[PDB]
Amino acid sequence: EYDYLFKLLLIGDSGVGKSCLLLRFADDTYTESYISTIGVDFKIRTIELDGKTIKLQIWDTAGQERFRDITSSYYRGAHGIIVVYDVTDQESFNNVKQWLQEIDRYASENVNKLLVGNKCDLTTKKVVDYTTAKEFADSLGIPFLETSAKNATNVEQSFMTMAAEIKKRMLE
Numbered sequence: 001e002y003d004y005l006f007k008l009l010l011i012g013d014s015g016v017g018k019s020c021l022l023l024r025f026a027d028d029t030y031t032e033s034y035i036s037t038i039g040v041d042f043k044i045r046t047i048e049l050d051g052k053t054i055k056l057q058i059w060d061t062a063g064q065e066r067f068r069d070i071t072s073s074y075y076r077g078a079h080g081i082i083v084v085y086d087v088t089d090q091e092s093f094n095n096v097k098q099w100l101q102e103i104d105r106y107a108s109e110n111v112n113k114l115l116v117g118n119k120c121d122l123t124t125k126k127v128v129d130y131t132t133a134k135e136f137a138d139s140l141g142i143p144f145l146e147t148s149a150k151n152a153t154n155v156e157q158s159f160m161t162m163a164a165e166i167k168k169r170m171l172e
């Protein structure tokens, strides 16, 4: 059982590692093989926060951003949305603004937001500096972390940070 159930969604440009982030967190696996669908709509991981048991239900886009678009209902039912970009791809960071506008168009009014810059292991290809993305996130009052699904860097922390934000909003 659990004290709380939080529904999370990862959004962002195709191929930034959203599915790899989910699979690393929920299953502790990583592959470079191409992923269209993960065989389920969501994965589950149960965490502990402040002595409370929190079931996290984390939904995958099923690659719908590859050739079409994310449906509005996927936005509306989330308690928190993680916007992911690829630190080696300037365009994916530029498009974070558009993903935030989609959240404003379709998500719940009080949804929690978190910015993640993934593939932080690719040091020689990195083009979005930590300071650039942190300044942007700070300007919106949204938390920000850099992650590596491949090396597991900050992946658990990213989901724990989102859970902490949601719990704080729920208790207020």
Ligand SMILES: Nc1nc2c(ncn2[C@@H]2O[C@H](COP(=O)(O)OP(=O)(O)O)[C@@H](O)[C@H]2O)c(=O)[nH]1
Binding pocket: 012, 013, 014, 015, 016, 017, 018, 019, 020, 021, 031, 032, 033, 034, 035, 118, 119, 120, 121, 122, 147, 148, 149, 150, 151
């Ligand atoms: N180097 C590195 N590559 C990654 C990482 N996460 C994902 N990738 C690569 O990015 C590709 C696309 O990841 P995927 O999870 O399918 O992206 P999605 O379309 O956003 O769900 C993968 O096949 C990996 O090659 C990471 O943390 N580091």
Ligand SMILES: [Mg+2]
Binding pocket: 018, 019, 020, 035, 036, 060, 061, 062, 063
């Ligand atoms: Mg995917």
